[PDB]
Each structure stands twice: as structure tokens, then as C-alpha cells.
Amino acid sequence: SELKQDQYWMQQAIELAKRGLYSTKPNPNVGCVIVKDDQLIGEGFHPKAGQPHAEVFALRQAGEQAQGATAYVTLEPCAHYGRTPPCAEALVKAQVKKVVVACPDPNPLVAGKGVQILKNAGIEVEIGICEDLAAKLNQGFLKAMSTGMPYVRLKVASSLDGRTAMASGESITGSAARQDVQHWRAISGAVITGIDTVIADDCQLNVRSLHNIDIETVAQPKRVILDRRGRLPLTAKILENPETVMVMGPYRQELADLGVIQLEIQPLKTLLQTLSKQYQIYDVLIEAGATLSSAFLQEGLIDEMISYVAPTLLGQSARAMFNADFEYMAQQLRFKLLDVIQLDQDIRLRLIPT
Amino acid sequence: SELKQDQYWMQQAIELAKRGLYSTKPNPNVGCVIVKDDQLIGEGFHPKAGQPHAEVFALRQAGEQAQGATAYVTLEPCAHYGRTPPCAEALVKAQVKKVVVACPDPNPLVAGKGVQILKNAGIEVEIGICEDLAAKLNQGFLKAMSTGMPYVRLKVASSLDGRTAMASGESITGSAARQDVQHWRAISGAVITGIDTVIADDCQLNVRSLHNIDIETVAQPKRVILDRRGRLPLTAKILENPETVMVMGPYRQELADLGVIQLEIQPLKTLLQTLSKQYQIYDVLIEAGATLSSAFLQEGLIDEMISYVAPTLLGQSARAMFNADFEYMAQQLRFKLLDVIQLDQDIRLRLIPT
Ligand SMILES: Nc1nc2c(ncn2[C@@H]2O[C@@H](COP(=O)(O)O)[C@@H](O)[C@H]2O)c(=O)[nH]1
Ligand SMILES: Nc1nc2c(ncn2[C@@H]2O[C@@H](COP(=O)(O)O)[C@@H](O)[C@H]2O)c(=O)[nH]1
Ligand SMILES: Nc1nc2c(ncn2[C@@H]2O[C@H](COP(=O)(O)O)[C@@H](O)[C@H]2O)c(=O)[nH]1
Ligand SMILES: Nc1nc2c(ncn2[C@@H]2O[C@H](COP(=O)(O)O)[C@@H](O)[C@H]2O)c(=O)[nH]1
Ligand SMILES: O=C([O-])C(=O)[O-]
Ligand SMILES: O=C([O-])C(=O)[O-]
Ligand SMILES: O=C([O-])C(=O)[O-]
Ligand SMILES: O=C([O-])C(=O)[O-]
Ligand SMILES: C[As](C)(=O)[O-]
Ligand SMILES: C[As](C)(=O)[O-]
Ligand SMILES: [Cl-]
Ligand SMILES: [Cl-]
Ligand SMILES: [Zn+2]
Ligand SMILES: [Zn+2]
């Protein structure tokens, strides 16, 4: 089947795209393979902002044999000049016979323009092959470019009885869960937390450990601290790397002098739009306490909740994970369960609102 | 390997034992295969109290060819007369060459006596083959016979935030979890609940639905209701089948006239010992509210907790699953996680105290 061969090669391209997962932000993960007479002649992936696009690497490998070949690309070749020349033009120049595209461009202001340039040159273009699987490569980018809002993941860690701490915030989950969290942080443009967490935990919320990846190649998440009374202590550990920190609160000259980006107090929905529009942050991880976590949930600002549950009971006086006060069952916040996995002694659920 | 062949056949016997899982109580699940010249000549399992033991069925099949053969039995052949003749004597009579035993007898007053009868006849006896796997056939019976206390499973159903109901007991988990609970009920000699649950839910706590098993062959759990003020309404659904009901509370002639077994108010640990010693109940399922469930937990009376968690948030005013008031993290009740599975939209954890 010609469809199944197209799917076979696009799946190779989707695999290449994953080599950049942690280093591409704000740019999309993109793979590309070039195939001729059923033979692979060029592979490429986008490693990092400012570096060449996937198609460019793949063509450099393919060389002159790219003429008459088929290019499989997980995303629509670009039609504009920025830090690099446009990919649609490179494919034309290489005189490929056919370009197969998984996802069209999510930005409505440019969508279809790359394909159009291919149509004009007489290049065969078919679109939609393994689109579902390719979309999983770019949940944040695709959402942010099509709607102006980032993809938001809420992380929570609790006991079996749904508690996050004793009455006084003494603290559940183990090292396997901690390692898993590294992955979620490393695909995020920002980790959002509240001042309460920073004061209680003195956390860094950064990426320090990943499987099969050198941490120096990681594009680190910005640490976004919601601090409405401007209480962030200057000695906080989260401030050792100040240029990757943003504080939402009353303007403090101490913070500006350190290079910390300061945001005016704004509604959570507006905050998310700001991060996407002004700061190119398309994947957000929330790592916060009950109050801030519940605010995001109740305002309907969560795309996915990642819940770590530890095999322990903390009792009815320990801190509730979700602090809404509901009366009737009809008010419950129901989610669709995607999956559950075991992480040593903990478990992790992934959940999508309904 | 002679060990691996012994293991191969014992595993066939362990499999046969499972055919009686739901109908054997209070008797143990027991399988038996008879093998000669590497050929299976007889299989047997114990189906139900009063019926022949596994070895008897297997020998009836083996017939005269049982002479010189090897018998694999998941539990030590009995050495005493009750409702049936003793199995040790049947094997001798059949003139088997060798008897392979997984689990020795758990009752210390009779342990080794069956083996002794085999030793005396010159019959080869080796013991311990796939013991771990065979023990899983009889968690309750083996515990109760060796210690006088039943194996106790605590079932709980909660939201992700560890809640069981709204402030007023309005009620989470779905049909897949409900079906799973049927299995746990069907291996139990008793389901224990409190009056609060009976009043709120009007539950039956019986077995009505099982995979690949006719419900008429099931030996139903007794429904044990803890009712210290004697409030059980005579119109309660749990009372439609009164002879399988036990109430712990102040004596009521209304209940005796219906045939309900009445227990005097006693401590929970004493209650469990009573059920085992006086009523031959070796596997207990607790299906109760927060108060009674927490009492069992805090008194250290739980062997295993089976926790069903639904993908929903009920909020901080909904009923806590565990009502202890702890202050420090050191007071937490920690469990070892055995496994987690997905049940459609819910999950189930199995947990063992530490
Ligand atoms: N690559 C990767 N994926 C992880 C990790 N931890 C959890 N996951 C998630 O768990 C798997 C679930 O499959 P999915 O349905 O998301 O494709 C992965 O796809 C990924 O989303 C991790 O450490 N590395
Ligand atoms: N046979 C059976 N086992 C179940 C069912 N639901 C849960 N289980 C448990 O889940 C599996 C876990 O394997 P185990 O470690 O207990 O041998 C089974 O062994 C059994 O204990 C059920 O409906 N039928
Ligand atoms: N903890 C915390 N909650 C916030 C913050 N900003 C907004 N919220 C909560 O989000 C909800 C809606 O407020 P808005 O997002 O419209 O400002 C309110 O319940 C508010 O308390 C914040 O910076 N920190
Ligand atoms: N809800 C409930 N709790 C009980 C019952 N029997 C004992 N408990 C609880 O178990 C704990 C120890 O009491 P004991 O088991 O020594 O009578 C106490 O906290 C007590 O309230 C009962 O029948 N129902
Ligand atoms: O990033 C690269 O080096 C590539 O795609 O070859
Ligand atoms: O600092 C606070 O209290 C806040 O952010 O709301
Ligand atoms: O129970 C039976 O009928 C058996 O074991 O053959
Ligand atoms: O009925 C009650 O309140 C009880 O059992 O404790
Ligand atoms: C598919 As592209 C964003 O590398 O032109
Ligand atoms: C192993 As038996 C209890 O059937 O004698
Ligand atoms: Cl916080
Ligand atoms: Cl109860
Ligand atoms: Zn491009
Ligand atoms: Zn017997």
C-alpha cells in the first residue's frame, strides 16, 4: 500500500523529531526524511532555536540525489525569512518530486503558504499522514499558534487521601516520581509556582537530570513566580539564575537590578496569554500549592493534570490538594483518565478535563 | 531438571485449585494431579464444603494406574475423619510411589501428620514446590489456621482528592470497579460494614455477577453489620436474606425471629477472632464508611487495602476517606504498593501496610 509506505517513512520522521524535544523551545519539534527508490538518503531534525530547520539537515545529507525524491516532514515547510531562509524554497531548489506533510502550520496568518509554494513549482503535496501522532510532538506550539493560549499541565503530588502536607507545611513521593517530573519540566517553556511554595520548599524548579540527554543541551524552563505582595526573598535558591526568572507582583527595583523579568499583577488567563504572546512560552507546567492549583482548575485553565499519588495516609487535618467548597455531586470536577503508571512505590495518573 | 518437571505439574495442580475459588469457603482451595511415565492420568479440585477432597477426584480418574504414580497436591493431604475419610490414607491405598506437596498444613495441631502417614507407608514425600504460588490460593485459610485471625481486606472508593461523599452523604466509581468488587466479595467469608452505610446506601453487599462462574455455585459472604445502637431497619434490603446476616449490637428479638445471627458488642480485634474461631470466616472484606474504615486501619487490623480512585475532584468540604488527626509526617500510615491497574475510567491500587 502506498499509504502504508508513506506512513512508514513519516513514522521515521516523527522519531527524528523527538531528538530535539528538550532543546527546541520555542521552536517546534520537526523531523524530516528524504526517500528515493524506497531508499533513505537523508534524515534531519531541528535541534534548537537559531539552528537550521529539519528539511535543511535532511537535504544536506541527500545532496544532489534529492532531485526526484520524496520528502517526509512532520510539519508544513516554512514560507518566511527570519533567523534562517524559508524551507519551502529549499525543497523547490532541490527539485523534489513530492513533499509529504503531517501537520499543517498552526499559525492561521501563515497556514497553507508553504504548501502553496510547493504547488506552484509542480511539486506533489499530500497532507495529513500520521497527523495525530505528529501533533503529539507539539501539543503546546500547535495550541498556542492556533489559539493564543499555551498548553497547560498541572502537576500535583498527594497522599492516597488527597493531602499535600501536614497542617504546618511539613513534607511524600519518591525519586522515581521526581525523575518523571524532570521530563515534564524539560518540555515546558515555563514552570509556574506561587510565592508560598518558594518560601516553604526553597525549590529551583529547573532541569538537572534526564535519560539519555546531556543537561547542557536542554533549553531550560523560565521559573514564573506569582507573588502578589512582592515577598520573594532575595536569598531564595530559585534566584541563583535570575535571568531565567519572572515574577508577577508589585515592581521591585531589587529584582530589575538582578535581571529578573517583572510582570504586573494580572488575571491568570491574561498571564497565560502574556507568556505565549510576549515571551513565546507555549508549554506551561504548574508546580504550586493547593490555592494556586485550585484557581487554575476552577478557572478552566488546565489542559492536562498529572497526578502523583503516594501510598500513604496523612489524615483529615493535613492540607487538602483541592480547596474548592462544593455542596452537590453535580459540581464535581470530572476528568477523563488517559493512563496510569507505577513509579516505584508511587503512581502517576494523566487526566484531561471534561 | 527433575525440579522443573515437579514445578510444571504442581503448576497444573495450582491451576485446578482455582476452579473452586468462589465455592470452597470455609474449606481451602486445593488442586491435585496424578502423573505416571510423564503422563497426566488424573486431575482433581475441591469444589465445595462437604464434597470430596481434590486427591479423591484425581484418584477416581487415575483408577488402578495410580499405583507407582506421583501425586502433586497444593496442600498437605488430611489425616483426619470429618465429613469425608482422610486423604493420606487414600493415597496409601492407591499405592502411589511419591506425593509432592506445596503448602504444609497451616493448623499447628495437625501439621505434619498427613506427611507422617505417607512416610510410614514408604511413600516418597517432598515438600515446598511452588509454595509461594500455592499460598496465594489460600491467603485467609493459611493465616487463620496458623494465627487464629482472618486475612482482612479493606475496600475503599474515593475521588482523586481522597473524598467519599459530599458533606451530606450524596454519592463516584463506575461499573468496571463495581465488577472488580464482585471478585473480592466472592472470595470472602464475610463482608463487614457499619450501620451508617446500610442506612445511607441500602446496600446488599452480596455476589450477583462473576466472569465465567454461575452465581448459584458461589458460597456467599455473610454480611456483618456493626450496629452498636441497634438501629438496623427491618425493611433494609440487606435483610431480605436474613440467615446470611450477622449483627453486632444490643440483642433484638426481632432479629433473632428472622434467623439473623447476633453478636454482642466487642472490640474489632475480638470481632475478627470470633468470626474465625466460631464462624469459620477466614477472609474478611471491609466495605464501610470513613469512621469504621479508619478504626480498622488505626488498630492495625488490615492485611491489604484495595483502593479504587475515580478521576474526579469533590472539594475540601466532602467527606475525608481517613479520619485520623495526625500532626507530624512521622505519624503517616505508609503502605507498600503491590500494583495499580486501570478499570475503565477508575484505577485500583492494592496496598500492604508497613
Ligand atoms: N519520553 C518520555 N515520556 C514520558 C516520560 N515520562 C512519562 N512519559 C509519558 O508517558 C508516555 C505515554 O505515552 P503517550 O500516550 O503520551 O504517547 C509517553 O508518551 C510520555 O507522554 C519520560 O520520562 N520520557
Ligand atoms: N481472578 C481474578 N483476579 C482478580 C480480579 N480482579 C483483580 N484480581 C487480582 O489481580 C491479579 C493480580 O495478580 P496477583 O499478584 O494477585 O496474583 C490477580 O492475581 C488477582 O489477585 C478478578 O476479577 N479475577
Ligand atoms: N494564589 C494565587 N491566586 C491567584 C493569583 N492570581 C489570581 N488568583 C486567583 O484566581 C482567581 C481569579 O482571579 P483572577 O485570575 O481573575 O485575578 C481568584 O480566586 C484569585 O484568588 C495569584 O497570583 N496567586
Ligand atoms: N464505627 C464503629 N467504630 C467502632 C466499632 N467498634 C469499635 N470501633 C472503634 O474502634 C476503636 C477501638 O475500639 P474497640 O475496637 O477497642 O472497641 C474505637 O475508636 C472505636 O470507636 C463499631 O462497631 N463501629
Ligand atoms: O541537528 C542535526 O545535527 C541534524 O539534524 O543532523
Ligand atoms: O503572596 C500572595 O499572597 C499571593 O500571591 O497571593
Ligand atoms: O469437582 C469435580 O467434579 C472434580 O474435581 O472433578
Ligand atoms: O451505630 C453506631 O453509631 C455505631 O455502630 O457506633
Ligand atoms: C516544517 As519547518 C517549521 O522546519 O519549515
Ligand atoms: C490437601 As486436603 C485439605 O484436600 O487433604
Ligand atoms: Cl504556591
Ligand atoms: Cl459504616
Ligand atoms: Zn523551515
Ligand atoms: Zn483431604
Numbering used by the authors:
A (entry chain A), B (entry chain A): 2 to 172, 175 to 357
Authors' account:
We selected a bifunctional enzyme, diaminohydroxyphosphoribosylaminopyrimi­dine deaminase (EC 3.5.4.26)/5-amino-6-(5-phosphoribosylamino)­uracil reductase (EC 1.1.1.193), called RibD, in this pathway as a potential target in Gram-negative bacteria. In bacteria, the second and third stages of this metabolic process involve zinc-dependent deamination and an NADPH-dependent reduction at the ribosyl group, respectively. RibD is constructed from an N-terminal deaminase domain, which carries a Zn2+ ion, and a C-terminal NADPH-binding reductase domain. The overall structure of AbRibD is an arch-like dimer and most certainly not a uniform globular entity.
The second form, which crystallized in space group P43212, has one subunit in the asymmetric unit, with a crystallographic twofold generating the same dimer as observed in form I. Both crystal forms have an estimated Matthews coefficient of 3.2 Å3 Da−1 and a solvent content of about 60%. The exception is oxalate, which was observed in crystal form II. Oxalate is a common contaminant of polyethylene glycols owing to polymer breakdown and crystal form II was obtained in the presence of polyethylene glycol 8000. In form II, the side chain of Arg84 is oriented away from the active site, while His81 adopts a conformation intermediate between the two observed in form I. All residues interacting with the oxyanions are strictly conserved in RibD sequences, with the exception of Arg84, which is sometimes replaced by lysine. In crystal form II Trp174 is not visible in the electron density, suggesting a degree of flexibility in this part of the active site consistent with the altered positions noted in form I. Crystal form II was obtained in the presence of 5 mM GMP, which had been added as a potential substrate analogue for the deaminase reaction. Unexpectedly, a GMP molecule was observed in the NADPH-binding site of the reductase domain, occupying the adenine-binding pocket. There are no direct hydrogen bonds involving the purine moiety and the enzyme; rather, it is positioned by van der Waals interactions with Leu271 and Leu295 on one side and the side chain of Arg231 on the other. A second GMP, refined with an occupancy of 0.5, was observed positioned in a depression on the surface of the protein formed between α7 and β14 (data not shown) and distant from either active site. We do not think that the GMP binding we observe is of biological relevance; rather, it is a consequence of the crystallization conditions with the high level of GMP present.
